[PDB]
Amino acid sequence: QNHVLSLQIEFLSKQLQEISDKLDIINLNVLINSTLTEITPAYQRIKYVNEKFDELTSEVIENLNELTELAKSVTKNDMDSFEFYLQTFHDVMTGNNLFGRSALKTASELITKENVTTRGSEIGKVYNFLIVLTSLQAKAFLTLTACRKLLGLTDIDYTQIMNHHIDGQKREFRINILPTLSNNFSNPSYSKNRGSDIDDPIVVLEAAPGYALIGFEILNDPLPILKGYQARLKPNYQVDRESMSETIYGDIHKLFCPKQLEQKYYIKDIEFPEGYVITKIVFEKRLNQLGYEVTANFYDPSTGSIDLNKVKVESWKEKSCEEDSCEDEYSIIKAETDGIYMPLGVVSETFLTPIYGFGLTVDEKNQKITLTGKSYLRESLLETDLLNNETYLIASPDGYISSIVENWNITSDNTGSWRANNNNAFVDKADTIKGSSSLYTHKDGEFSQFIGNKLKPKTNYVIQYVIKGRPAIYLKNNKDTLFEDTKNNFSDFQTVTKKFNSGVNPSEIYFLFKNQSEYEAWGNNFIILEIKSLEFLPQMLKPEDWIPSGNVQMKDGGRLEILGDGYFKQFIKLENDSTYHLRLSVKGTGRVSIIDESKYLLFVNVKDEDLTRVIKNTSSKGECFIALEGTYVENSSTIFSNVSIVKE
Amino acid sequence: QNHVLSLQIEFLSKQLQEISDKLDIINLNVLINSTLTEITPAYQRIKYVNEKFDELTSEVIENLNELTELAKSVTKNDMDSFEFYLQTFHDVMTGNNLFGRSALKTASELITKENVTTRGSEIGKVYNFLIVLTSLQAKAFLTLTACRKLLGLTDIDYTQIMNHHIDGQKREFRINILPTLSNNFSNPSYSKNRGSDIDDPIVVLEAAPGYALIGFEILNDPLPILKGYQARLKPNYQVDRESMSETIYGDIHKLFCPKQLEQKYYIKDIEFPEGYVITKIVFEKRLNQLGYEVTANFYDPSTGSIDLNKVKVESWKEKSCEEDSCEDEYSIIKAETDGIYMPLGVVSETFLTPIYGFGLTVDEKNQKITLTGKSYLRESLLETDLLNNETYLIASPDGYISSIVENWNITSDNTGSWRANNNNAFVDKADTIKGSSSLYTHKDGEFSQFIGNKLKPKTNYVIQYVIKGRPAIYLKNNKDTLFEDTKNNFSDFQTVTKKFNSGVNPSEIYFLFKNQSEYEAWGNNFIILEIKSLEFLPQMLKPEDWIPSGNVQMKDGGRLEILGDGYFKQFIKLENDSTYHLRLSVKGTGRVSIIDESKYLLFVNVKDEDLTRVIKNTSSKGECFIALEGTYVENSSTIFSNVSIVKE
Amino acid sequence: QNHVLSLQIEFLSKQLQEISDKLDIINLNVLINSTLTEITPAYQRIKYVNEKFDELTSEVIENLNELTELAKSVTKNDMDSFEFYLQTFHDVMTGNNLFGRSALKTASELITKENVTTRGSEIGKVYNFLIVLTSLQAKAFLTLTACRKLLGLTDIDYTQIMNHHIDGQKREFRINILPTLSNNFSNPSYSKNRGSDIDDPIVVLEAAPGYALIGFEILNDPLPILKGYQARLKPNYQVDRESMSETIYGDIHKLFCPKQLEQKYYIKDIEFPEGYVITKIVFEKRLNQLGYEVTANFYDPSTGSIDLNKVKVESWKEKSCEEDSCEDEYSIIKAETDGIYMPLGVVSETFLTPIYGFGLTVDEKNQKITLTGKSYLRESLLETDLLNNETYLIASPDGYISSIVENWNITSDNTGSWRANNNNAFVDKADTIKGSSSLYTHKDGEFSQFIGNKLKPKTNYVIQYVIKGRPAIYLKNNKDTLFEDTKNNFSDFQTVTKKFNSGVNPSEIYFLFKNQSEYEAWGNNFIILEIKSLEFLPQMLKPEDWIPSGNVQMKDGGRLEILGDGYFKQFIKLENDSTYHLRLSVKGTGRVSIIDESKYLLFVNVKDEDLTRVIKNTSSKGECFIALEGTYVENSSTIFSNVSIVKE
């Protein structure tokens, strides 16, 4: 009963903590209400004046008169003038109020609390809040200069006042707000997909010797796949806009998700000292023990050059290695059925930036995977924008940046390698809207483009395309349309991704973006790229030493289909002190037999399942062969998939 | 003492929950204060401009000049213009603020908390909040066009801007607000009226063939009464107006409230898959066991046309699927001496829709008898106004819509049912000048209307009507009056909700609304409808085989008077393995008799009270009957009340 | 230890209650912030316009031009006009906002919480809040009419709009706010003074047969004294302005405060039915058992007549009498030394009103006295102002309303019975300020007034006077200045109260408000009235049956000073079955002796103390005499004060 009272008191202490959190949210909302009462009339007026003067700071007589009257209202020297609202906005931003509170402080406190589903860090969110307000004021001073010029009044030079206002606010942020926080983020969201276990996958993300890795990306709309970003770096941990890349990878769910068997994920914030940039991250999943490799070459921060010889390496992935180099302290996961919470979305920073540290922080208690990096972000922005230089600051990549299709983002009214094969297939910057060219094709239009020369045989490719109407999408080599999408009619530019294995001869594939059989079709942003197939670590089995025994044929995936009476055997050498993870998946019922010479080291029936037999320390006298003797009947088709006796 | 400490800790946990609820109300009020600080100056100005331009968007030189000056102020292109206030209203509504909060979100959070005495659902309340704001903006753009035209300025076409503003707000509602709610509904209040335990009230709530039942309603002012509605079901789970109707049942306190004996309440959440619409409910209270058999039919969501072939009947049998004691899944309400808190008011859904589920949700902790059905309203709207096609929306009613009196209130200028017998006894207003439509009689006044052909012998009818001044209500055939009220001179149009029993031969009873005196009279809203006499489950007592034995005769209420001495006798075969329950009250000191050929299976006298007898194994030797006798007093005519020998 | 845990949990439950109270205060402050955000810009502008147009709605050309320009701004038909601010003020008051909250509701919730040191009830405070806002709007419509007339514009008749606004707000108050509360208040504050115990005080507060008691008052600046209010009543529990009175009483601390001995204060809400008005309240303190008497004659509410024969009486004061008429259930107080928390301030309602009920709710746990009345206030205001008739509504009396000095509030530049005896003693409406005449007398001024004819011998009088400068205050009969105040110089009209026993001949006392010896003097509000001396209940001792025995003399207070060798004896009759509270206080050491004939029923020495010997049931054979034999020496002066052998 005293134990029951203790549990009830622990329940009360939890309720009091939830109450104390609710109070901290309420107190903050009260401080937001104070700053809104101070800043809202100025913010709303500045916004309206900035929006209504967009063309001039970027019917003729009517709008010019309607704007001239507004300009007279704006430049008027009243107590309630536009200059009054600009000054009060600056004062509330800095904290020159009745009680010394700043709008930047209450905003920073807000962002720190409501950072629930936020992609980036507290510094980057509070700084983005500062950027939108400084841009609003700068545009407001620009409209005020434009209004004075339009009326023919004298130039007051608001550059000095605007600079004093912007610098004082950046100084308030630097002194009282920024001694904030940390450079660690993760993947945006989680997803449940299925992978593999009898595989030995391995994935490297290495940047060019002049590049550093500038981000990641995982999409699963065609299939779960890792997209890898890297680019040449500019001074002060800045990045060159061109040379940025997105590196599509294999069935990344495989290396991510298990199949009803445990996983080994080591946990450590690999971090090298400053200036060191990780131009390569390997990943290695062998026997479901998924490791990786984070190593950083140095980078001279001042001159955009990454060092090409001063590598720093942490071969292991676990915090136990950070002190002992003994491979332990992973995170073990008992595999859930539907699929592990694989990362979904884009693994990058709001601004592409060299990361110096990275850590794996999977939380198997919820079967959820989480990462943690460490980047030079404070040391990249702290020198250029916070010192107000030529800002080379580029937002994060949401999706695809390029395409195998040239001019895929047709936006300047040009075809390029596209081919305007009709007078309804005219490039038409305003195909359906001048917001973007999206090649117009109505009732006979066709835009063609050779894409096959880049389509290479026995390789999967990704395709996406922003298409209005019912477009005639074609991946055709004039003989075999490796993929065609002429099915959907889209009034609202619906874009989706699929896959296809480039056939034996894709090297002739034209893209033929025609209209349709007949409809009104539009389309741009024809993102097509190559889907990498996942590679795997070695083994002891080989697709060549197999000895077919009649009515048995091997397939493209080394599949060795048992077409009936017969088998494949492979003389493999097994040794006394060595262990062997014999692992294989079958399509169609059958058996597998390791007859050394007379003894059955292994003989089991396989219907459709992942074999995982770990052949223990056993001396195979002479040579043993895994006689892949599937079912022995006419309609027997025992298609193995992964021939792996991979030795422990 | 440890048990006392546990109870004190449970009291602390309740106090902490009340504190956590208070914090959630406070946090919401703080978020309302933020949105008020943002939106109030625009809302107030839009409202004032909309109200002051009503005739123009629906003394002349003065009003025209004052409105022309107002129009010059409204159309003026300042920073503080009417267009500024419209744009800021749109931005605060969508969430384009300093911190990304929308007025629609804080309003939805408000309505979700203060839904205490709200008639309709969260969706319908938040959508009604959206409608009043969108209408306010649309009228504001309309006054702005009217002001430009009045001044003679160029037309700017604000239809495009208004549509963009309205659609963006409806999109915000559809995406970020609407993906919340439930569709339960219950009674608002409760009533205490001593019901029945002597009787077995079974009540059927069945819809017409083309109808489904579309609401409940509980009355106590005329009497404990069940009010009901039923109507055709249109396409899209909406309901046909003109096919609605009313049905009124008797003493439903006797159906729900027990009197001085406990009542069993089969909590039975009868629910059906989608497409099913309740075409029948039976409520079953035998031996105070309030079960209820319900039969819902299926219904084609589109094209209306409830299909009368796919029915389901889950009477009490949701626990039959899991437990032999299907007699479980109930509750126990103990009848205190004033009755039980039967519902009072209305168990219905905000807007008219088929209900699919129903359950019994009594609360004997407060005697709170609560009905609860499951409506299709969520569906009935998510497809209609969310798509903005027809929105055939009718909210739930409150009083009687159906009346035997034709032109029950008045249509207008025409009382074709009534008779304007006198010229001066005209209709007082005749068009919208005296509040609502209402008859009027003065110094001779009368209004005759034949409804005797619509009145049945010996049946209870509930009466409602609204009257002002000096009225003389009459319901007569110029020879006897069924209902009359010519008193209580009142202020303005007060409502009656009472009952009466229709006469023994009312085939000629017509209504004669006259004047109370030589003064002027007013009245309207004459509601007349039948009250279905409460009907009970049959038991082996039938009045015909009664043998009136000695100065006696069969009576009306199933009563069997005993004038002085004598009795009523009738043979009823009791069994030696079955239990019977003789439940009967008397008016006059009586003696009931359960005697065998020699011995007294029961030996009881009844003075003026009921009789609750649970007879154990009734050893039966053939001869079983009851001699419903009184005692040897000349004055007290023994008059039993309710024959019920119900065979357990 | 479990008991210690229970006490700790009770401490936690108290902390949670203090937290829940803090939340209710916070939630209310958040609702006040919402209404302030809605109503503040309108309230401030209405207030400024009302204050700046005061002389017109009550430097010629310059003020007229500045007000004409202001009037042009006020009457201007803009979106931000004065009419806009009036309409928005009305809408926020009624609750026609974005979310349906009314300023009247949040204000009522405020007043209900912050009613800590509030004199009147919740109804009267919330109604006073409604009055100040309705008056603000009415004055605002009035300034708007005045501004239109001043500019020469057409009359718009804002009476209709103003009436609609005022009536709609009074309707909101009547429906949603007023079904509020209760008619019970108490004394405003508490005070620690000292009284008496061996006294038998008794105080009646009876209104004239045409009057009802209209309030109370207790002041203690000269000495703690009760001031009693009563007046003839006007229809609907209204009061005639004249005939109001203030009835000064005795040393009310005496009847209020004990002297180190217990008190008996009975507790009951004496309440008679409606129309019954308490035209008399007796109070009786005998043997420290302080009782009273609250009896109510009827009052025909319609015609201002109190009934003069239909008395209703509750002779006792205790709730035990309200059911048994057995004198018990008092509140007993163990007397504190410094003094009981006697009522300080004015015991009345904010508006003078007939009280029908009254209760004593002393709280001796804090030694604090509290009262509780029940008045017809809702039924007096509910008919006149809430029906908008000629409001005869008079605020509560703070201090004195009249004076024995005629024209005491010299305000119309007239002396009256005052006498301007100098050309520096000129009445001078602007003596020092035209805000009030306050008779000016500089360096020779004198104002004289005969006040002695009303000053009656051997009676105490109260005096107060609002005086600037050093005034020559005189209560002089040209031979003996019974009191004179020529001492203080007051720049700021400092007024104070004192006392004086009118001498053997006060009937000639002139008031001679001269200046001074010489200074600048001012003065008005010469409140002078008669200080009643406290009377007492009877006893068995008598000041006449005393038998002096040489060197002994009686004084004015029946004091019987023992001037040395000698005594007073008084043959008193004591009986067997009777008890006698012999009680007496002495000045100077001495003794008292009750020699019956030979036996010492009582002989004790008395130095300076309250004798309280309760002579028990004792048969005095023949006659006994209390031989007041004080100290027997030359310098013996044993001045007894209260000769009371008052028989139990």
Author numbering:
A (entry chain B), B (entry chain A), C (entry chain D): 141 to 198, 214 to 803
From the paper:
The Vip3 (vegetative insecticidal protein 3) family proteins from Bacillus thuringiensis convey toxicity to species within the Lepidoptera, and have wide potential applications in commercial agriculture. The Vip3 proteins have molecular masses of ~90 kDa, and are secreted as soluble proteins that form tetramers in solution. They can be proteolytically processed by trypsin or insect gut extracts to yield products of ~65 kDa and ~21 kDa that remain closely associated in solution. Vip3 proteins are proposed to exert their insecticidal activity through pore formation, though to date there is no mechanistic description of how this occurs on the membrane.
To investigate the structure and activity of proteolytically cleaved Vip3Bc1, we performed a trypsin digest to yield two primary digestion fragments of ~68 kDa and ~21 kDa respectively, which we term activated Vip3Bc1 (Vip3Bc1act). Mass spectrometry analysis indicates that these fragments are formed primarily by digestion at K205. We obtained a 3D reconstruction of the digested complex by single particle cryo-EM analysis to a global resolution of 4.8 Å (0.143 FSC threshold). The structures reveal that Vip3Bc1 to VipBc1act transition requires extensive conformational rearrangements, but consistent with previous biochemical analyses, retains its tetrameric state8 while opening an approximately 5 Å pore. We were not able to directly observe density for an extended alpha-helical bundle in our single particle cryoEM reconstruction of Vip3Bc1act, however we were able to use deposited Vip3Aa16 coordinates to generate a model for Vip3Bc1act EM density due to high sequence identity (59.9%). We observed that Vip3Bc1act associated with the membrane in an elongated ‘open umbrella’ conformation, ~15–18 nm on its longest dimension to the membrane, with a stalk interacting with the membrane and the bulk of the protein density distal to the membrane. B Scaled comparison between segmented density for a single particle in the tomogram, with 5 nm scale bar (i) compared to Vip3Bc1act model (ii) with an overlay showing the stalk density fits the 4-helix bundle well, and the density which is distal to the membrane is consistent with single particle Vip3Bc1act model. The helical stalk modelled in Vip3Bc1act does not account for all of the stalk density observed in the sub-volume. Following cleavage, inter-subunit interactions at the conical tip of the complex dissociate, allowing for helices α1–α3 to rotate and move down through the gap between the ‘propeller’ regions of adjacent monomers, and form the extended helical bundle at the base of the complex, as visualised via cryoET and consistent with the reports for Vip3Aa1616.
